RNA sequence: UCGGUUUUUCAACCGGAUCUUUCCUUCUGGCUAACCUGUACUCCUUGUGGGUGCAGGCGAAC
């Protein structure tokens, strides 16, 4: 169960995560068999400005619903075992390039592998079972695109201690600056 | 039919500037409109502006500086041939000097000066003087 | 296009200066002469596997493609072994700085190396004057099906 | 601004900002699918099915809940009608109008309305031909239209 | 007029303005979670109807469709969402 | 503006309105200079030193001018609460 | 320096090469040019100052 639940398994961090998962399995009726049908493509470590660190756990995609079914509890448990650091369950998506006027036909691209769509999906996922209200995008006089993301006025506190971390993760992923917001 | 969208965007903006609104709401709002606005910004005609990601088509809120005078989009997108550019600028802009003709090219939606420097031109969209 | 029959005229027709020796043993019997037209075109197998003669074909005849190579939609198939391509283009009036959707019909002889249906785009080539109006040979009916195997909506 | 009158209405169904499922509203996807298929079997036409789902059951829009559309789902299960729903309805309306006209010889307004209906049908027919849902060179009008209806 | 910091207005203005003409459009129609005097079960029923709406299996009829918001059948308790 | 090697030309450098940035014209027989006094504790209204605005004729003519002035005040800290961002 | 001259201090400006979750139509062989190279190690300022050199292998230099 160590070098098995990892799709392709090289790194020590991955092994540690697997071990943690195994340890978690001690709960039994709700946090086993449901957790057995879950794999990590890989993990990416994102360093957040403020002492704390963030961990992006990549998931192959058809698994996402299952992960969501668990998630919150699982995340909490992971936080408990891997202290200080926050964990984001993320879905790895392919992002097929744009066809060029010259470049030979890639039997059409679906609007799923487009960059924008992928980024939107990441935003949906990276942010909790919180569900995004609206987006604004600011463009500032200098020339700095700043995504501004609106969050549900209910639940909330599941996100407060992570917002900066989330932002950092997003920046590392894409390059765009996210600001998170909640209305009154 | 809202046939052309850039046109619509500019018209409302123009109206706002004429009244002395500090802000406009643009209804449909494209890639093209955004690019145009960016171009305007780069030479400081428009302030901040915020594209609402409507889970639909779009919406742009603009901040006006009062530095706008008229922003026009020309009706068909006339394909324009590097020398034609000069003619257009003579016609469309208040001086041999300042303001910009905003022509779309293969290298992107630039103003006219930039296009000349880059040595590439294409179809015209708007202008800003 | 031709469509069946093979050897149905008042005369009886064969490829000229190309001859099948009755003396030699061959299961293939008839020797077909073909021509690789060139210009990056793949010469359709439905000539080499084919049985027709047809003097105005670019592959199995003395007609040879030089000069212009154009494209365009097929309007009309209504006459035998030839086609009417409609090469539609935009011509410019400077006085207004604007354009015309202009017509013009190219009649092109079609080798029966092709199955050409109304609406299909055709890479056609210029050649030796076939007849009266026809000065082009159909070279590539590039639209192979255009939803023909998958027309039905039900799963 | 309305295809046939001088009227310029903006009564319309709106849509919610979330493409995601509305959280608390339970059930599943499979159940929803089953319901849809049952409704299809019963002879209801897409819009009707959707309506049924929305009000009695825990449905907002099938796209939100299942992933795929209603029509798409129908196509997948092979239960969708041969002439598209809207078009079919239009045809029915036309038939009705024709019937009325048959009875009432002098009813100019009705005739005029029938003309408009026919025009609408033609437009729809054309677009179906273009997207290939009605097999090409099929025209829908007066004599055969009635036969088509049922 | 002149300046109206657009994107965030008051909830009252939003409530007043036509629910299509707002910023981010959201329906101002609810899901009545309705209880009947018969069985102890709740049904998720849209605030508008277009259908005479019976229960999960029972022929109770929850709501009669008027032009807009559904007028509920005499004495039936209902939650929200 | 400037004649090549420095040397400023173009005299009468237009007042711009503080509300609209629209140029206050030469015969703006409609526009105004608003002067508001910088103020201090017990009596004290500090003569000589004002926070000043110009309002162009056009806005005033339109009618919406008071609100603009309020806005200007709230920015330069001559008021608090009076005029809000959202209406 | 006997009105012109080029680098550093400096920018804007166009261009190219790139990795980023991102490929430029693809390989049969020519040709590999140089090192991803090391086979002996040293003429030599106490040494990554400097490469004549042949067996695994970068293709874009066409
Ligand atoms: Zn009930």
UniProtKB/Swiss-Prot annotation, chain B:
GO cellular component: ribonucleoprotein complex; ribosome
Keyword set, alphabetical order: Ribonucleoprotein, Ribosomal protein
Cited Pfam families: Ribosomal_S8
InterPro entries: Ribosomal_uS8, Ribosomal_uS8_CS, Ribosomal_uS8_sf
PANTHER family in alphabetical order: 40S RIBOSOMAL PROTEIN S15A
NCBIfam families reported for this sequence: PRK04034.1 (NF003115)
UniProt name for this protein: Small ribosomal subunit protein uS8
Gene designation: RPS22
Curated annotation (Swiss-Prot), chain F:
Localization (cell): Cytoplasm
Cellular component GO terms, alphabetical: cytoplasm; ribonucleoprotein complex; ribosome
Signal peptide: none
Pfam families: Ribosomal_S21e
Main localisation: cytoplasm
Single GO molecular function: structural constituent of ribosome
InterPro entries, alphabetized: Ribosomal_eS21, Ribosomal_eS21_CS, Ribosomal_eS21_sf
Record-level GO BP terms: rRNA processing; translation
Keywords in alphabetical order: Cytoplasm, Ribonucleoprotein, Ribosomal protein, rRNA processing
Quaternary assembly: Component of the small ribosomal subunit. Mature ribosomes consist of a small (40S) and a large (60S) subunit. The 40S subunit contains about 33 different proteins and 1 molecule of RNA (18S). The 60S subunit contains about 49 different proteins and 3 molecules of RNA (25S, 5.8S and 5S).
Function: Required for the processing of the 20S rRNA-precursor to mature 18S rRNA in a late step of the maturation of 40S ribosomal subunits. Has a physiological role leading to 18S rRNA stability.
Similarity annotation: Belongs to the eukaryotic ribosomal protein eS21 family.
Name under which the protein is recorded: Small ribosomal subunit protein eS21
Organism lineage string: Eukaryota, Fungi, Dikarya, Ascomycota, Saccharomycotina
